[PDB]
Amino acid sequence: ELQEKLIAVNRVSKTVKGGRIFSFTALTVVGDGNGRVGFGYGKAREVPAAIQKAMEKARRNMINVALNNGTLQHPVKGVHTGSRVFMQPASEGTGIIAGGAMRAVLEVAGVHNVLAKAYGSTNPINVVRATIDGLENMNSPEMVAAKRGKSVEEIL
Amino acid sequence: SMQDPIADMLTRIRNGQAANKAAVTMPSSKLKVAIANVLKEEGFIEDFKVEGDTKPELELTLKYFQGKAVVESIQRVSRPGLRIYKRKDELPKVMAGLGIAVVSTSKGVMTDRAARQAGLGGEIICYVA
Amino acid sequence: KIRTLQGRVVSDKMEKSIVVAIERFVKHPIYGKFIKRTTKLHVHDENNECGIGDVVEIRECRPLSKTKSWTLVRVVEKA
Amino acid sequence: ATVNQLVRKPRARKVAKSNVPALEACPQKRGVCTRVYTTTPKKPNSALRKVCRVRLTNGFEVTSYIGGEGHNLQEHSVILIRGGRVKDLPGVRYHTVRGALDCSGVKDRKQARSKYGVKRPKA
Amino acid sequence: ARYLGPKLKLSRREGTDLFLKSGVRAIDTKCKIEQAPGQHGARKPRLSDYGVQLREKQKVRRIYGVLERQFRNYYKEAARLKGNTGENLLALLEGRLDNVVYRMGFGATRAEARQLVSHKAIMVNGRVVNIASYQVSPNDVVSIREKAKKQSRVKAALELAEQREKPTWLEVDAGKMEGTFKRKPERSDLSADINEHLIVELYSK
RNA sequence: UGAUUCAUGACUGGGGUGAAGUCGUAACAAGGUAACCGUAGGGGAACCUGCGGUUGGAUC
RNA sequence: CCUGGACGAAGACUGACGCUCAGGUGCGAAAGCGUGGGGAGCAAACAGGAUUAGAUACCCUGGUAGUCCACGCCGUAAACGAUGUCGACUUGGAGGUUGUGCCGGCGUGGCUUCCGGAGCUAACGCGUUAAGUCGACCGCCUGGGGAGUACGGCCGCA
RNA sequence: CAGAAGAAGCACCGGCUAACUCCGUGCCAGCAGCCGCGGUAAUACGGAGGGUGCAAGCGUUAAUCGGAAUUACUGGGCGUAAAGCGCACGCAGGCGGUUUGUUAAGUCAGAUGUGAAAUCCCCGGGCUCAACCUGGGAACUGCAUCUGAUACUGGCAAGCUUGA
RNA sequence: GCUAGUAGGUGGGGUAACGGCUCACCUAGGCGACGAUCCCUAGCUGGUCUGAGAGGAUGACCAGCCACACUGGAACUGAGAC
Ligand SMILES: [K+]
Ligand SMILES: [K+]
Ligand SMILES: [K+]
Ligand SMILES: [K+]
Ligand SMILES: [K+]
Ligand SMILES: [K+]
Ligand SMILES: [K+]
Ligand SMILES: [K+]
Ligand SMILES: [K+]
Ligand SMILES: [K+]
Ligand SMILES: [K+]
Ligand SMILES: [K+]
Ligand SMILES: [K+]
Ligand SMILES: [K+]
Ligand SMILES: [K+]
Ligand SMILES: [K+]
Ligand SMILES: [K+]
Ligand SMILES: [K+]
Ligand SMILES: [K+]
Ligand SMILES: [K+]
Ligand SMILES: [K+]
Ligand SMILES: [K+]
Ligand SMILES: [Mg+2]
Ligand SMILES: [Mg+2]
Ligand SMILES: [Mg+2]
Ligand SMILES: [Mg+2]
Ligand SMILES: [Mg+2]
Ligand SMILES: [Mg+2]
Ligand SMILES: [Mg+2]
Ligand SMILES: [Mg+2]
Ligand SMILES: [Mg+2]
Ligand SMILES: [Mg+2]
Ligand SMILES: [Mg+2]
Ligand SMILES: [Mg+2]
Ligand SMILES: [Mg+2]
Ligand SMILES: [Mg+2]
Ligand SMILES: [Mg+2]
Ligand SMILES: [Mg+2]
Ligand SMILES: [Mg+2]
Ligand SMILES: [Mg+2]
Ligand SMILES: [Mg+2]
Ligand SMILES: [Mg+2]
Ligand SMILES: [Mg+2]
Ligand SMILES: [Mg+2]
Ligand SMILES: [Mg+2]
Ligand SMILES: [Mg+2]
Ligand SMILES: [Mg+2]
Ligand SMILES: [Mg+2]
Ligand SMILES: [Mg+2]
Ligand SMILES: [Mg+2]
Ligand SMILES: [Mg+2]
Ligand SMILES: [Mg+2]
Ligand SMILES: [Mg+2]
Ligand SMILES: [Mg+2]
Ligand SMILES: [Mg+2]
Ligand SMILES: [Mg+2]
Ligand SMILES: [Mg+2]
Ligand SMILES: [Mg+2]
Ligand SMILES: [Mg+2]
Ligand SMILES: [Mg+2]
Ligand SMILES: [Mg+2]
Ligand SMILES: [Mg+2]
Ligand SMILES: [Mg+2]
Ligand SMILES: [Mg+2]
């Protein structure tokens, strides 16, 4: 049901009296390929435990995306920290034209055709947050019609 | 000094929506009224009224849907420091057609969809989404 | 009709000749801002009627000297 | 920068200098060796690296690396140099082309032969 | 200009059967199909995302026998043509004459059907065509030449074609040894283990 | 008779890089006289001292 | 004694007369320079006494420019809020200072200190005196070192 | 007609980056675009076996654009990262509250002329296919002229009082 | 900052033709921070390469235009050439 993807594993370190203590971090995303997506970030002493913590957090933090037949509704911009991303709907057969971190998010969410570009910092943790922030704020003609007090047909 | 009353109008809307204000008030002008008319017909604001004679005062009643501002973004395009005019075949589309562009044509101020149907270009006043 | 430019007299110190500045208003090719550009033409002014400041009215003709190829039609506004 | 400021002074592109100026935008250049010797690299490397001083047909006098194990080069040898910096060697911006002009190919080389001017063995 | 080496190492690298043999035996009776070739072939490859895109492109190439320069040109045309680029690319590979001849049953494999095309034994609407990459149009008639109707491999190839699923966009007459290309195969008529969207994304890297 | 540009010149000015020899220990902690800025004078060297200024000073 | 600006309260008057500003011009701490005065205290330089391995210092005893005045020059400072000017808009709290209205109590202006909300920010923090939301115009940046140096120009007695 | 008969190489395999082992060497010899590798158990040097990528080519070098939103018009910054002139006044320049009328310069619409052919793009046609050749369109985003539109910007005239 | 045939005017001459094209005389102008003058580099275009585009780079082959013909200078002939 849920597609899981491991985006990045990093080794971090803190210093103590006896020397350095290493640990690992894991960044993952989960999604149902139909408009739901979440990301999790886990820390542990061993890689497998870090990944399992991340998968566990991701499943509890999914948001909803209003997709339009495997693509976006309109161009969107997302921002988080140094990361600025841009995404655009594309025609069928285009595929996912996106960088590695944006690709994992877009794919587990069910986006099949999209043109994307990451500006600024490409740190994966912040690119994922910016991507999901762009998808979560995307509007559909339904909600645009509702808030404006108009029918969908007068919108399109 | 004040050099763009239209940008001041849009900013008052933008800032009032962020402050959850029920209405915003500002000195009036015929161009401001013409823009208010388009905002109302598209359902972005609720109503407007001009009050006063020698110093008219325009008041815009803002709307909120499910506790959220209806105007998600409002942005000046043409501005005194840089005017923007578009021909009919190059009128912009806001949010893939889900938003509007307020265009000043020789037949008056209207949306980008209305200007396309009349086969006219003009000055791109602002985007509303 | 006849093509015709209109500008302002910036010099009248020549015998039967004047310098006229024509202002154009064009969009900058890169930055899109509308800017003012100027061209100064040497114009034939028989009768020596124009003074510095007048808004005149000129047309293109045959060469009359090394630099003159325009001639005064009328005065639109006097200074 | 405002558009008014850009109308007066437009954006300026930074001109980049070549890392191989003695080639003068030619793919190779021929020179005459004026000195053949060894030199030791920067920290943290240690070796006796084989280089040569070579006066080019355009008058430039530069240093060129001699790659591969063993060479036949001496003073007055006529060689062909190409672009290519040697990272750990101070100011060596060019490589000698093995197997061109007076530079012989490397002996007994079996892999990456075309990079060292070695003909195919008859096996 | 043609791969001329062992045929099963290809299918073993791609981890699936590429129909590179006739089919008289089972691909597991001739090779260790589920094992990649070589000394380290038993290892478990940790394919990067680029590696997964690359292997999908090499699979489709190795099925039809196209080299990279020719394949890249198919992609450029597929992207130029209107419609879904990934499906356009499969329709162009299925239009090749050597492929059409094989799908009709005249060759046991695509390599054999290519030798039949190359050796001047095939006609299109009544003209000899010996270009393996010739594009077959709708309603075109592909047929075996008379001097080649007596070859023993063409009937051995016709008796293996019914052992496989019959293509529904063609129409073969095993008797007169000629078929008609009625229409371009839809995406549904083609295999589902080919993930052509990976190829389209690979050529945007 | 000028201007400009290229090459070259005993000697000389500082700069970069390498390497680490000699002399000290100026800065980083209140770095053992808080540091730094402008200016002036002095000193083998880092610098020191006067005058005004800053906190991008620890303690209290 | 001569003289500039700011603010408030009621009115009257003009009628867009406005905002910003390359080049230009003026002002511009301290030190420093020129001429003429002045010189208590302080004190670069300098001298001696100490401290120290040394001590061209820190400490002590002295002490000259200078610090002061008149006129002229210089034109630089961590000249800092390290935050250009002008205008509009957007929850609050506690103070300082200076007006003014009303009945200590209630308002209403100007300038100012600290905290903090949304928002913004890499973070620290900023937060109606914005680093928030916008408009107008200007100045400036484009890896570190070489270097704010060389050469040339302009300015300066230096 | 005859017979598989005459016809496969080049780079790479530590990470970016598709592809791993042994032996030799022992900060040497050497590699290197960068991170870096080499000190006696080297997937990084050299040979070998195996593998990967291209293929009558494959590598290297040179050079341009890209990635570089790293000169940012589209599309960046300036409290502390590089960056607000020490502070002002002010000419040129840029910008300009509100109402009516007029003008039609900017702007917008339409027409006409021109924008050579080739090239690019679309639908076709012809060489067995393709490259290539070719018919017809579109495009040439411009300029000029004419006729209209008048909201906005500009000009001219008259005001207004909220900026000054 | 530059310019004295320099900027304009009148008259004569000259050219296939307008013209400081040339000469005499008169006027004292003309160009320039919307970059004159001076210095360095360069044939221009249709196009070509790159780029999602805006741009950036470029101008070989093919076609249009210009310039040159050992170096400097000159005219003659001719519808047309320096
Ligand atoms: K080393
Ligand atoms: K010299
Ligand atoms: K010190
Ligand atoms: K300190
Ligand atoms: K000092
Ligand atoms: K000494
Ligand atoms: K100034
Ligand atoms: K004293
Ligand atoms: K001591
Ligand atoms: K004294
Ligand atoms: K000074
Ligand atoms: K301060
Ligand atoms: K008060
Ligand atoms: K009070
Ligand atoms: K300024
Ligand atoms: K002096
Ligand atoms: K050994
Ligand atoms: K910009
Ligand atoms: K002349
Ligand atoms: K004359
Ligand atoms: K061009
Ligand atoms: K010549
Ligand atoms: Mg970056
Ligand atoms: Mg004349
Ligand atoms: Mg080929
Ligand atoms: Mg110390
Ligand atoms: Mg100290
Ligand atoms: Mg200084
Ligand atoms: Mg001293
Ligand atoms: Mg002292
Ligand atoms: Mg002083
Ligand atoms: Mg002195
Ligand atoms: Mg003095
Ligand atoms: Mg004195
Ligand atoms: Mg003392
Ligand atoms: Mg300064
Ligand atoms: Mg101060
Ligand atoms: Mg202060
Ligand atoms: Mg400053
Ligand atoms: Mg605060
Ligand atoms: Mg900031
Ligand atoms: Mg200097
Ligand atoms: Mg001076
Ligand atoms: Mg790999
Ligand atoms: Mg070993
Ligand atoms: Mg090796
Ligand atoms: Mg760029
Ligand atoms: Mg930046
Ligand atoms: Mg600093
Ligand atoms: Mg700084
Ligand atoms: Mg300041
Ligand atoms: Mg001012
Ligand atoms: Mg106005
Ligand atoms: Mg008009
Ligand atoms: Mg054409
Ligand atoms: Mg055909
Ligand atoms: Mg054509
Ligand atoms: Mg008007
Ligand atoms: Mg008007
Ligand atoms: Mg002439
Ligand atoms: Mg004459
Ligand atoms: Mg030339
Ligand atoms: Mg780009
Ligand atoms: Mg003649």
From Swiss-Prot, chain A:
Alphabetical list of InterPro entries matching this protein: Ribosomal_Su5_D2-typ_SF, Ribosomal_uS5, Ribosomal_uS5_bac-type, Ribosomal_uS5_C, Ribosomal_uS5_N, Ribosomal_uS5_N_CS, Ribsml_uS5_D2-typ_fold_subgr
Primary role: With uS4 and uS12 plays an important role in translational accuracy. Many suppressors of streptomycin-dependent mutants of protein uS12 are found in this protein, some but not all of which decrease translational accuracy (ram, ribosomal ambiguity mutations). Located at the back of the 30S subunit body where it stabilizes the conformation of the head with respect to the body.
GO BP: any one term: maintenance of translational fidelity
Similarity annotation: Belongs to the universal ribosomal protein uS5 family.
Protein name, per record: Small ribosomal subunit protein uS5
GO CC, any one term: cytoplasm
Gene Ontology terms for molecular function: rRNA binding; structural constituent of ribosome
Impact upon substituting R103G: In strain: NEA-314; neamycin resistant
Domain S5 DRBM, residue spans: 2-65
Gene3D superfamilies linked to this entry: 3.30.160.20, 3.30.230.10
Further comment: Altered uS5 proteins have been identified in a number of mutants. Some mutations in uS5 have been shown to increase translational error frequencies. Some mutants in this protein can partially suppress an alanyl-tRNA synthetase mutant.
Keyword Acetylation listed: yes
Membrane spanning residue stretches: none
Description of its domains: The N-terminal domain interacts with the head of the 30S subunit; the C-terminal domain interacts with the body and contacts protein uS4. The interaction surface between uS4 and uS5 is involved in control of translational fidelity.
From Swiss-Prot, chain B:
InterPro entries recorded: Ribosomal_uS8 (IPR000630), Ribosomal_uS8_CS (IPR047863), Ribosomal_uS8_sf (IPR035987)
Domain of life: Bacteria
One GO biological process term: ribosomal small subunit assembly
UniProt keyword Cell division, yes or no: no
UniProt keywords, alphabetically: Repressor, Ribonucleoprotein, Ribosomal protein, RNA-binding, rRNA-binding, Translation regulation
GO cellular component: cytoplasm; cytosol; cytosolic small ribosomal subunit
A Pfam family annotated for this UniProt entry: Ribosomal_S8
Keyword Protease: no
GO molecular function: rRNA binding; structural constituent of ribosome
TM annotation in the entry: none
Role played: One of the primary rRNA binding proteins, it binds directly to 16S rRNA central domain where it helps coordinate assembly of the platform of the 30S subunit. Protein S8 is a translational repressor protein, it controls the translation of the spc operon by binding to its mRNA.
Family assignment from sequence similarity: Belongs to the universal ribosomal protein uS8 family.
Assembly information from the UniProt record: Part of the 30S ribosomal subunit. Contacts proteins S5 and S12.
Name of this protein: Small ribosomal subunit protein uS8
Organism: Escherichia coli (strain K12)
Swiss-Prot record, chain D:
Record bears the keyword Amino-acid biosynthesis: no
Molecular functions (GO terms): misfolded RNA binding; rRNA binding; structural constituent of ribosome; tRNA binding
3-methylthioaspartic acid modification, residue list: D88
Keyword RNA-binding: yes
CDD domains xrefs: Ribosomal_S12
Family annotation (InterPro entries): NA-bd_OB-fold, Ribosomal_uS12, Ribosomal_uS12_bac
One Pfam family linked to the record: Ribosom_S12_S23
PROSITE patterns per UniProt: RIBOSOMAL_S12
Modified residues (N6-acetyllysine): K107
Record keywords, A-Z: Acetylation, Antibiotic resistance, Methylation, Ribonucleoprotein, Ribosomal protein, RNA-binding, rRNA-binding, tRNA-binding
GO aspect biological process, one term: translation
Outcome when changing L56H: Protein is not incorporated into ribosomes
GO cellular component terms listed in the entry, alphabetical order: cytoplasm; cytosol; cytosolic small ribosomal subunit; ribosome
Family indicated by similarity: Belongs to the universal ribosomal protein uS12 family.
Subunit-structure text: Part of the 30S ribosomal subunit. Contacts proteins S8 and S17. Interacts with ArfA. May interact with IF1 in the 30S initiation complex.
Note from the entry: At least 19 substitutions or deletions in 11 codons can promote streptomycin resistance, dependence or pseudodependence; all but one of the streptomycin resistant mutations (K42R) are associated with hyperaccurate translation and thus reduced translational efficiency.
Summary of the function given for this chain in its UniProt record: With S4 and S5 plays an important role in translational accuracy.
Name listed for the protein in its UniProt record: Small ribosomal subunit protein uS12
Organism expressing this protein natively: Escherichia coli (strain K12)
Organism lineage string: Bacteria, Pseudomonadati, Pseudomonadota, Gammaproteobacteria, Enterobacterales
Gene: rpsL
Curated annotation (Swiss-Prot), chain E:
UniProt domain S4 RNA-binding: residue ranges: 95-155
PROSITE patterns per the UniProt record, alphabetical: RIBOSOMAL_S4, S4
CDD domains: S4
The organism's place on the tree of life at top rank: Bacteria
Any Pfam family matching the protein: Ribosomal_S4
Keyword tags: Antibiotic resistance, Repressor, Ribonucleoprotein, Ribosomal protein, Ribosome biogenesis, RNA-binding, rRNA-binding, Transcription, Transcription antitermination, Transcription regulation, Transcription termination, Translation regulation
Any one annotated GO CC term: cytosolic small ribosomal subunit
GO term, biological process aspect, one: cytoplasmic translation
Keyword Ribosomal protein: yes
Molecular-function GO terms, alphabetical: mRNA 5'-UTR binding; mRNA regulatory element binding translation repressor activity; rRNA binding; structural constituent of ribosome
Membership in a protein family: Belongs to the universal ribosomal protein uS4 family.
Subunit organization: Part of the 30S ribosomal subunit. Contacts protein S5. With proteins S3 and S5 encircles the mRNA as it enters the ribosome, which may play a role in mRNA helicase processivity. Some nascent polypeptide chains are able to cross-link to this protein in situ. The rRNA transcription and antitermination complex (rrnTAC) consists of RNAP, NusA, NusB, NusE (rpsJ), NusG, SubB, ribosomal protein S4, DNA and precursor rRNA; S4 is more flexible than other subunits.
Role of this protein: One of two assembly initiator proteins for the 30S subunit, it binds directly to 16S rRNA where it nucleates assembly of the body of the 30S subunit.
Protein name: Small ribosomal subunit protein uS4
Organism encoding this protein: Escherichia coli (strain K12)
Recorded name of the encoding gene: rpsD
